[PDB]
From a paper:
Citrate synthase (CS, EC 2.3.3.1), an enzyme involved in the TCA cycle, catalyzes the condensation of oxaloacetate and acetyl-coenzyme-A (CoA) to form citrate and CoA. One of them encoded by an open reading frame (ORF) ST1805 is termed ST1805-CS, and the other, encoded by the ORF ST0587, is termed ST0587-CS.
ST1805-CS is related closely to CS from the same genus Sulfolobus solfataricus (SS-CS), and they share 68% amino acid sequence identity. The final model is comprised of 376 amino acid residues per subunit (two residues in the N-terminus are disordered), 341 water molecules, a glycerol molecule, and a sulfate ion. In the dimeric structure, each subunit is subdivided into a large domain with 11 α-helices (C-G, I-M, and S helices, residues 3–216 and 325–378) and a small domain with five α-helices (N-R helices, residues 217–324). The dimeric structure is further strengthened by an extended C-terminal loop, which involves a β-strand interacting with the first β-strand (residues 13–17) in the N-terminus of the other subunit. In the hinge region in subunit A of ST1805-CS, a glycerol molecule interacts with two glycine residues (Gly220, Gly 221) and interacts with His219 with a sulfate ion. His184, His259, Arg268, Arg339, and Arg359′, which are important residues for substrate binding, are exposed to the inner surface of the open cleft. In ST1805-CS, three arginine-glutamate pairs Arg370-Glu56′, Glu368-Arg30′, and Arg356-Glu10′ are formed, of which the new β-strand made across both termini from each subunit lies between the former two pairs and the latter one.
Residue numbers in the entry:
A (entry chain B), B (entry chain A): 3 to 378
Write the structure that this text describes.
């Protein structure tokens, strides 16, 4: 059948946002190397870059921060609902629920004059919701993010109930930049489908989150890090890799091959972040050194011309090093990638709008005569 | 660059479920004409047809009813959250939120031994949720649906707190059949996109609902019906048509279709339902007679361009006759179409599964060197 499997070849839209050069292994947001953005900019500046199109001057940057800092509070029903949930609920399930309530209560209209500012407001509230989903699942009380010197600091402070170190803040800021956008996976796709009907911006995120909740999209950092936990020690790495992978059959996690020819540039930066925490904390070093050895084995026994660690291979270690339990890892992706979701759907609605409605190909039965039940 | 915008020519899957002949105006579910199903069957029989593939015998039909009747309960979090939201919230907002809570608390695994039975349970709870959304918005007390001789009766009784008449039960059962499936609109697309990541069934419905909440997909029954409310009386119909439609060149809502080039077979059946209610109720008759006259002017004007009454033209008058306020019309569509959503994602996951990841075409800025903030 002439089905577009996985929509693999299908260009669902154009974008001015993000460009992957898989051959040279370089990733750019709006023309800027992600290495420069991480090294010399910040999540707030990237927010302005993706939504408005250029890096912000001081005054524009201060306008971004001002919106964020006045936008952390969410409706009481969001918080009460989050904290009434059973504490073992999937964090993405809680997030999609939270965003349904945001939709129902704010129910923003689409409008060129305000879409960008709305997106910055949503980004603020995504921090509030993520931080308190952790706190809920831990059986703590709620804590709304408060204005501080950075978005990343405001988020971490609310999450953990104390002032983060400067190293923590920088790593978190880096992580928000690192996962802001890349390809058009099912979540971004779901968001675009919702935006094509002009469903409100919050509900477009609901759709994205609903797709991300699936284990073939969500869950990657979790599964990769769980390898290192199982291995337990660097001394154990070589045996584990032998009797699980080589004479095994179901394979290792956290390696890619499809997008980049040699190495994912994001993956490279997560590794450097992990490594930096490792020379400060023994438990982080233990997982980092395990990870390193598996990397060598995995690239050797599979060819370097082929595979590389993807972002998921070291991201969990950074997340762990920041204090986050494994059950938050996918949520920390969502916290970052929501910028890309927002930038993409605004791009679509304002510049390329078209209702999405694909075909099904009917097979299955030809016309038949109705048959009463006694005769069935 | 006029790429695959809208995905209109993309085949996203095959289906055994629904056949449409737009030339002769024929709709079939698994080979059976929609007229036979409405006239001689029931929603429970259609549930079994769509999910299991055939009309059920008495034993199989009793199994469907047994699952339904034991599955109306929802987590108390659902009630708590629904009833805590502002009474003016959009019903699909409230529904997408409710389904986020179900996904969080049930979090069902995909399993081909249980997927179909889980679908029936979800259909049970959709009635509970839709009934209580009505109740919340009217500041009424929650009420869970109870076992009864039929799904339509159980839904109607919970909603209005009163035993429905046999005509009401029959009209509701017909409605559930009539809107069960058709083409692959944005809601069905969003559910498929989520199912492609193996996101849990409830979250796949979450996704559908987020797409449905947009006014370019949801809201069609409401807008068509509101024409008649605005017309006010049958005597005013000709004046209104000439002013709004002929001179104002506005679109006649409830007319036209991408595939039907004759009368929507669904519109014929809704009309006959409306007709019957009209002869026993004066308020319904008022709107029916208005709708009749508009239909005549509409056909005279547009018939020659193969533009005819579609399924949304008469549906709202039916929902009105059943006692439903206008703000519930699209929810009642969701209540029916969920069978189609579920049938489609089960087909996809069990028989056609492929992770979905379309492409974006990069235009936008060439590579450029970082620019410190003082130079911006």
């Amino acid at each position: 059948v002439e089905v577009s499997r996985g929509l693999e070849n299908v260009i669902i839209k154009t974008t001015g946002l993000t460009y992957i050069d898989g051959i040279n292994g370089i990733l750019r947001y709006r023309g800027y190397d992600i290495n420069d953005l991480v090294n010399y900019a910040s999540y707030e500046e990237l927010i302005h870059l993706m939504l408005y199109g250029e890096l912000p001057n001081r005054q524009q940057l201060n306008q971004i921060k001002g919106i964020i800092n006045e936008s952390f509070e969410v409706p009481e029903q969001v918080i009460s609902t989050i904290f009434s949930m059973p504490r073992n609920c999937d964090a993405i399930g809680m997030m999609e629920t939270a965003f349904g309530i945001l939709a129902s209560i704010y129910d923003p209209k689409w409008n060129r004059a305000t879409n960008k500012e709305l997106a910055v407001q949503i980004i603020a509230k995504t921090a509030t919701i993520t931080a308190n989903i952790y706190r809920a699942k831990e059986g703590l009380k709620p804590k709304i993010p408060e204005p501080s010197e950075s978005y990343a600091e405001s988020f971490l402070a609310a999450t953990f109930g104390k002032k983060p170190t400067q190293e923590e803040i920088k790593a978190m800021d880096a992580s928000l930049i690192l996962y802001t956008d890349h390809e058009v996976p099912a979540s971004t796709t779901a968001a675009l489908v919702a935006s094509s009907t002009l469903s409100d911006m919050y509900s477009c995120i609901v759709a994205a989150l609903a797709a991300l909740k699936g284990p073939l999209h969500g869950g990657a950092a979790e599964e990769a890090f769980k390898q290192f936990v199982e291995i337990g020690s660097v001394e154990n790495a070589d045996k584990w890799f032998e009797e699980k992978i080589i004479k095994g059959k179901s394979r290792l996690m956290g390696f890619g091959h499809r997008v980049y020819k040699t190495y994912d540039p994001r993956a490279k930066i997560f590794k450097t972040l992990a490594k930096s925490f490792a020379e400060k904390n023994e438990n982080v070093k233990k997982y980092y050194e395990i990870a390193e050895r598996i990397e060598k084995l995995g690239v050797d026994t599979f060819g370097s011309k082929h595979i590389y660690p993807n972002t998921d291979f070291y991201s969990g270690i950074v997340f762990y090093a920041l204090g986050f339990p494994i059950y938050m890892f996918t949520s920390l992706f969502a916290l970052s990638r929501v910028l890309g979701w927002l930038a993409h759907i605004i791009e679509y609605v304002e510049e390329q709008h078209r209702l999405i409605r694909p075909r099904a190909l009917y097979i299955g039965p030809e016309k038949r005569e109705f048959k009463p039940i006694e005769l069935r």
